[PDB]
């Protein structure tokens, strides 16, 4: 069967994406996990595949699994987000540090990632119309007229998610050991840049759209103030990212 | 902005849906519509009047949800809302009295405590109209405290009193958590209390810091330092208990003290 071929191949992708190698999850295999969700309009074999891995024995393998999960939530078929809701309990179980076991010290990073991913899934449950990177043009195309009162509440939820990303990236930067490169730690910043920029772009477009063309727009000033605060804070994050040679080799850091 | 009569009619629908008997958080877009109304018309009078022809007191969940909605409108509405709220103190008080007791679902004590807190909040804003409803930080308030330390002392004391009200109320809300049910309606009241407590905390911290440099009288401010420390440790515990609530953390960032 070519069906059994497809299942066998995804199993290899998940395995190799979460190997013991202390670096970024192998891109071709993470890419193949993402593609699988689009090809079959289903992520069920992805979640099943991760559950049968020997990933809890090494905290690097657990951390690489969470990076892979994050990327698949971001870029996979929309159903991936829906099917992730049933796996909240399993995702929460990864926040342990049984084996690893703090020789390289990923425990705090694993707990912070699990907290973030559950917060991401909480948002997508509340706001199912979004895709994994909060695309504005995809979001606003689904209806003719959009409620600015829903828009206000949605932005404050996104800003709260932006705060979790900023806390998490700062924790990753603190864990950088001086000599000998931190490629696995730095690789987690790749989807965090994508997440934070996705949020930034949407809030920019939506907050602009909500402003009445003339008048003071007094009601939106709390969002403007928090938007500006998060902008300058995101500039600092992206400046620190642009000075990492390994991170800039993987992605283009947004300007802002 | 629409026709006045038609605008009040649409606001009535928002108030109705926000205060429905569904044991949930007040439906957020309708609470937002109530807040936005005050900015659009530069007046909260329609909101207060709209609440008067919305039956809520027969159902404890509706009454508690109404008090959450009132709290959010006081926080985020046009500044005139706080002034116009003063004439509705008697009515807010009436929501608790005509006593029920516990109630079937146990919102009775939470209702009475929310009314108690909201009256204390309005008492503060009457005495101290320089602040806004959400205690959005303004450095100017600490500058006033530098130049008028007698006034600053009294304002810090009153801020601390309001902080104690929030601490007592949040403790009561946590004690009424039930293992059956998502606790969303109860937890949706904690959200504005966390926001308000932090705003108060930032003001107390900055004003008390500013007053030590200006006056140089460590003996006179010692009671405020003693109370500050106590309230700090309480607030850490409050924010710690909130950190494990996933509905709350999805809506607001908990401060790290």
Residue numbers in the entry:
A (entry chain B): 7 to 262
B (entry chain A): 6 to 262
What does the paper say about this structure?
Clathrin-mediated endocytosis is essential for protein retrieval during neurotransmission and receptor recycling. Accumulation of the adapter proteins at the plasma membrane initiates the endocytic event and contributes to membrane bending. Complex formation has been observed between the ENTH domain of epsin and the ANTH domain of Sla2, the yeast homolog of human huntingtin interacting protein 1 related (Hip1R). Epsin and the phospholipid PIP2 are essential for clathrin-mediated endocytosis, and we show how assemblies are formed between the ENTH domain of epsin and the ANTH domain of Sla2 in fungi.
To understand why the ANTH domain of Sla2/Hip1R is specifically suited to bind the ENTH domain of epsins through the lipid interface, we determined the crystal structure of the ANTH domain of homologous Sla2 from C. thermophilum to 1.8 Å resolution. The overall ANTH fold consists of helices α1–α11 and is conserved between CALM and Sla2/Hip1R subfamilies. Through insertion of a conserved Tyr 252 and a hydrophobic residue, an extra α helix (α12) uniquely occurs in Sla2 ANTH domains, providing rigidity. A loop connecting helices α8 and α9 has a five-residue extension in Sla2, although with non-conserved sequence. Based on the low-resolution electron microscopy tomogram of the Ent1 ENTH/ANTH Sla2 complex from S. cerevisiae, these insertions point at the epsin interface. Moreover, deleting the Sla2/Hip1R-specific α12 helix impaired the function of the Sla2 ANTH domain similarly to mutating Arg 29, which is essential for the ENTH/ANTH complex formation. Based on the C. thermophilum Sla2 ANTH crystal structure, ANTH domains of the Sla2/Hip1R subfamily do not contain an N-terminal α helix. A crystal structure of the Sla2 ANTH domain from C. thermophilum reveals that Hip1R-related ANTH domains have two evolutionarily conserved insertions that contribute to the epsin/Hip1R interface to enable PIP2-dependent ENTH/ANTHSla2 complex formation. Especially the insertion of an α helix around Tyr 252 provides surface complementarity in the ENTH/ANTHSla2-binding interface, compared to the structures of the ANTH domains of AP180/CALM proteins. In addition, residue Arg 37 can toggle its side chain between the canonical PIP2-binding site of ANTH domains, and the ENTH/ANTHSla2 interface.
